[PDB]
Design a protein around this ligand. Structure first.
Ligand code: CL
Ligand code: CL
Ligand code: CL
Ligand code: CL
Ligand code: CL
Ligand code: CL
Ligand code: CL
Ligand code: CL
Ligand code: CL
Ligand code: CL
Ligand code: CL
Ligand code: CL
Ligand code: CL
Ligand code: CL
Ligand code: CL
Ligand code: CL
Ligand code: CL
Ligand code: CL
Ligand code: CL
Ligand code: CL
Ligand code: CL
Ligand code: CL
Ligand code: CL
Ligand code: CL
Ligand code: CL
Ligand code: CL
Ligand code: CL
Ligand code: CL
Ligand code: CL
Ligand code: CL
Ligand code: CL
Ligand code: CL
Ligand code: CL
Ligand code: CL
Ligand code: CL
Ligand code: CL
Ligand code: CL
Ligand code: CL
Ligand code: CL
Ligand code: CL
Ligand code: CL
Ligand code: CL
Ligand code: CL
Ligand code: CL
Ligand code: CL
Ligand code: CL
Ligand code: CL
Ligand code: CL
Ligand code: CL
Ligand code: CL
Ligand code: CL
Ligand code: CL
Ligand code: CL
Ligand code: CL
Ligand code: CL
Ligand code: CL
Ligand code: CL
Ligand code: CL
Ligand code: CL
Ligand code: CL
Ligand code: CL
Ligand code: CL
Ligand code: CL
Ligand code: CL
Ligand code: CL
Ligand code: CL
Ligand code: CL
Ligand code: CL
Ligand code: CL
Ligand code: CL
Ligand code: CL
Ligand code: CL
Ligand code: CL
Ligand code: CL
Ligand code: CL
Ligand code: CL
Ligand code: CL
Ligand code: CL
Ligand code: CL
Ligand code: CL
Ligand code: CL
Ligand code: CL
Ligand code: CL
Ligand code: CL
Ligand code: CL
Ligand code: CL
Ligand code: CL
Ligand code: CL
Ligand code: CL
Ligand code: CL
Ligand code: CL
Ligand code: CL
Ligand code: CL
Ligand code: CL
Ligand code: CL
Ligand code: CL
Ligand code: CL
Ligand code: CL
Ligand code: CL
Ligand code: CL
Ligand code: CL
Ligand code: CL
Ligand code: CL
Ligand code: CL
Ligand code: CL
Ligand code: CL
Ligand code: CL
Ligand code: CL
Ligand code: MG
Ligand code: MG
Ligand code: MG
Ligand code: MG
Ligand code: MG
Ligand code: MG
Ligand code: MG
Ligand code: MG
Ligand code: MG
Ligand code: MG
Ligand code: MG
Ligand code: MG
Ligand code: MG
Ligand code: MG
Ligand code: MG
Ligand code: MG
Ligand code: MG
Ligand code: MG
Ligand code: MG
Ligand code: MG
Ligand code: MG
Ligand code: MG
Ligand code: MG
Ligand code: MG
Ligand code: MG
Ligand code: MG
Ligand code: MG
Ligand code: MG
Ligand code: MG
Ligand code: MG
Ligand code: MG
Ligand code: MG
Lengths: 174, 174, 174, 174
């Protein structure tokens, strides 16, 4: 047993390792979306940069779980990072729809970890999730939903002019 | 009943007074460690200053419980502050080991108070503990554990050169 | 065929995807080393930060291969990122020895890609490797070799005081 | 023989003169595109400025070949600069398609000169091409390809509103 460990259940330790992996998986998916939108035959570079920034965010969130594990006296255990589900992402609407689903998947895993922490009477882990993850997660889901609404309004997938305009106005100039 | 009191159980009020006392006790122990390391026949002044700073931190944490009590309409009730368990602290390793145990004792009392607050359905007291105590407590326990690991690596208790080097490199120059 | 593609062999395209994967693999290994050295029972935080910085460097080098692929009209194809070979890294000497081997493995893959680019008469890919990778790779290998020499001089693995001193003097304060 | 000449084949000297001419030819084509887009019955002035800037770039690249020739002890020999292939350029899509082809033609000539330099064992000329031309050439080809993709998305040639929007958003305000 680690000399620092106190009130830290083995199940929570394992679930934090699984969260770490899921954040890395999410980062890698967003990296794939970045590369797709930067293709010469896609060429929506502000959309590409949005996804690149989200990849970096998810990697930072993985790092925060590594540090959490060590602070509690758990032990980081890494697994393979699975490649993304698709190699090509269709268009801005399909990608944003996939991002919404990804963000909801990550949110459900966070919520499930909060349930576990609650069951194991671990208020430090509850706090960590509430303070560092849950709200920023709700904000991301909201933003992507707002984007999907606007992509539909702009006539995606058919309306290429609409897609062009989204890249100029909805996402920040890179 | 205080005019401000709302949703504040008598048991929680009493437990906050006991936490106040425990923080004062912890402060006083750290003060003893400070004085020991500043002795002419010990003379590890950066280690001494580390413990002096921790004494001041614990006193500030006691003050925060006094203010909490008043904000909720409870009543501060003070008890004697017991002298520390030892009059002399051996060496840097023994002191850090005693500090780890002290920090874990304080952590357990915080966690027990969170349990009580949860049982009495007091989310304000839960929040206060999560926001002001639990994380900083985990950080302190981690730091002291890291120090103990390094003191062992440096050959304590036998290796005086190792002890000298810890005071120069691991704790901030005072 | 991409409208931008010119003088870019399919074999080179595939080898760039494999390089991308290898850089991600190297990043992930360095992340594991970071987490290990930040454990409470290891606690060599400057060594940990050295490896964290190298993880970030390798991730940036992966990103540069993604961008290269798109610039040439190739297509990024991602594979799983394999977990590192070890879950725990022994001590600073064992980790640095593993890092040397990793850097040499990456170097050999770069050199092999340069051979391929040369065989396929692709001077743009040769230049990219020479200008962005080969020299920085030689510098990293040299630095890690210098470190191993110093860790041996300091008496690793047995000499814990030596290991402590390396973390204070050889790697930058984090 | 020039007193400075060393390791500089006559064939390479001649090919550098031909490259100089081709860069001047490319400059002149881009100037024609500039003038076309500035016509009162075309009036896409940001597109016009993009082509004017590229004309100036190609002229600068011609000048760099003149200086190279002199530095090696070769002798600049000028030929007529042929007028561009068209007197009118249709619309933004047709012009960008012609620019892509032009950039690929120049790239092929650069690559062919690198082959020649390699055959004549002239590493200075290889370096010059790799360091000053090949990468910037790949970037230009990529940019123009990205533009063509966006012009198609915007409904060119039929969609005049799309063409108007490209001039406002894709090319820098002049
Ligand atoms: Cl525990
Ligand atoms: Cl704890
Ligand atoms: Cl416990
Ligand atoms: Cl507990
Ligand atoms: Cl737990
Ligand atoms: Cl457990
Ligand atoms: Cl696990
Ligand atoms: Cl996992
Ligand atoms: Cl774009
Ligand atoms: Cl830490
Ligand atoms: Cl813990
Ligand atoms: Cl574990
Ligand atoms: Cl993992
Ligand atoms: Cl695995
Ligand atoms: Cl797996
Ligand atoms: Cl995964
Ligand atoms: Cl998907
Ligand atoms: Cl796919
Ligand atoms: Cl998903
Ligand atoms: Cl609970
Ligand atoms: Cl709890
Ligand atoms: Cl949050
Ligand atoms: Cl939401
Ligand atoms: Cl919006
Ligand atoms: Cl529409
Ligand atoms: Cl739709
Ligand atoms: Cl929007
Ligand atoms: Cl009450
Ligand atoms: Cl209240
Ligand atoms: Cl009440
Ligand atoms: Cl209530
Ligand atoms: Cl209460
Ligand atoms: Cl009560
Ligand atoms: Cl009381
Ligand atoms: Cl008391
Ligand atoms: Cl001292
Ligand atoms: Cl007050
Ligand atoms: Cl109250
Ligand atoms: Cl009271
Ligand atoms: Cl008291
Ligand atoms: Cl008393
Ligand atoms: Cl008493
Ligand atoms: Cl006491
Ligand atoms: Cl004691
Ligand atoms: Cl004593
Ligand atoms: Cl204690
Ligand atoms: Cl409750
Ligand atoms: Cl509650
Ligand atoms: Cl806290
Ligand atoms: Cl801790
Ligand atoms: Cl430390
Ligand atoms: Cl020793
Ligand atoms: Cl010992
Ligand atoms: Cl230390
Ligand atoms: Cl090709
Ligand atoms: Cl090319
Ligand atoms: Cl080709
Ligand atoms: Cl070729
Ligand atoms: Cl190639
Ligand atoms: Cl091919
Ligand atoms: Cl591939
Ligand atoms: Cl691969
Ligand atoms: Cl350290
Ligand atoms: Cl690009
Ligand atoms: Cl290419
Ligand atoms: Cl491919
Ligand atoms: Cl990959
Ligand atoms: Cl795979
Ligand atoms: Cl695989
Ligand atoms: Cl891998
Ligand atoms: Cl290994
Ligand atoms: Cl292992
Ligand atoms: Cl290796
Ligand atoms: Cl070659
Ligand atoms: Cl070549
Ligand atoms: Cl380099
Ligand atoms: Cl080297
Ligand atoms: Cl060195
Ligand atoms: Cl030794
Ligand atoms: Cl050895
Ligand atoms: Cl060194
Ligand atoms: Cl010569
Ligand atoms: Cl020469
Ligand atoms: Cl010669
Ligand atoms: Cl020669
Ligand atoms: Cl030559
Ligand atoms: Cl000759
Ligand atoms: Cl000539
Ligand atoms: Cl000519
Ligand atoms: Cl205009
Ligand atoms: Cl000159
Ligand atoms: Cl010469
Ligand atoms: Cl000549
Ligand atoms: Cl000419
Ligand atoms: Cl002529
Ligand atoms: Cl002629
Ligand atoms: Cl000409
Ligand atoms: Cl033409
Ligand atoms: Cl014409
Ligand atoms: Cl052409
Ligand atoms: Cl050669
Ligand atoms: Cl050569
Ligand atoms: Cl270049
Ligand atoms: Cl290109
Ligand atoms: Cl673009
Ligand atoms: Cl249209
Ligand atoms: Cl068309
Ligand atoms: Cl564009
Ligand atoms: Mg132990
Ligand atoms: Mg376990
Ligand atoms: Mg698979
Ligand atoms: Mg909270
Ligand atoms: Mg918050
Ligand atoms: Mg966020
Ligand atoms: Mg999130
Ligand atoms: Mg507009
Ligand atoms: Mg605007
Ligand atoms: Mg009253
Ligand atoms: Mg009472
Ligand atoms: Mg007594
Ligand atoms: Mg509850
Ligand atoms: Mg709660
Ligand atoms: Mg907090
Ligand atoms: Mg603290
Ligand atoms: Mg505390
Ligand atoms: Mg095509
Ligand atoms: Mg292929
Ligand atoms: Mg495996
Ligand atoms: Mg260089
Ligand atoms: Mg480097
Ligand atoms: Mg490298
Ligand atoms: Mg020293
Ligand atoms: Mg020093
Ligand atoms: Mg002469
Ligand atoms: Mg000649
Ligand atoms: Mg003619
Ligand atoms: Mg070079
Ligand atoms: Mg260059
Ligand atoms: Mg250029
Ligand atoms: Mg060029």
């Amino acid at each position: 047993v680690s000399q620092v460990r106190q009130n830290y259940h083995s199940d929570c330790e394992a679930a934090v390792n699984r969260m770490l992996n899921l954040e890395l998986y999410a980062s890698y998916t967003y990296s794939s979306m970045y590369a797709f939108f930067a293709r010469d035959d896609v060429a929506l570079h502000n959309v590409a940069e949005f996804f690149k920034e989200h990849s970096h965010e998810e990697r930072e969130h993985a790092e925060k779980f590594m540090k959490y594990q060590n602070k509690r006296g758990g032990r980081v255990v890494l697994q393979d990072i699975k490649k993304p589900e698709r190699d090509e992402w269709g268009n801005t609407l399909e990608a944003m729809q996939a991002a919404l689903q990804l963000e909801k998947t990550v949110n459900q895993a966070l919520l499930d970890l909060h349930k576990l922490a609650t069951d194991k009477v671990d208020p430090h882990l509850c706090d960590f999730l509430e303070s560092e993850y849950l709200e920023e997660q709700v904000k991301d889901i909201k933003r992507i939903g707002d984007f999907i609404t606007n992509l539909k309004r702009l006539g995606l997938p058919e309306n290429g002019m609409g897609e062009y305009l989204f890249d100029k106005h909805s996402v920040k100039e890179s």
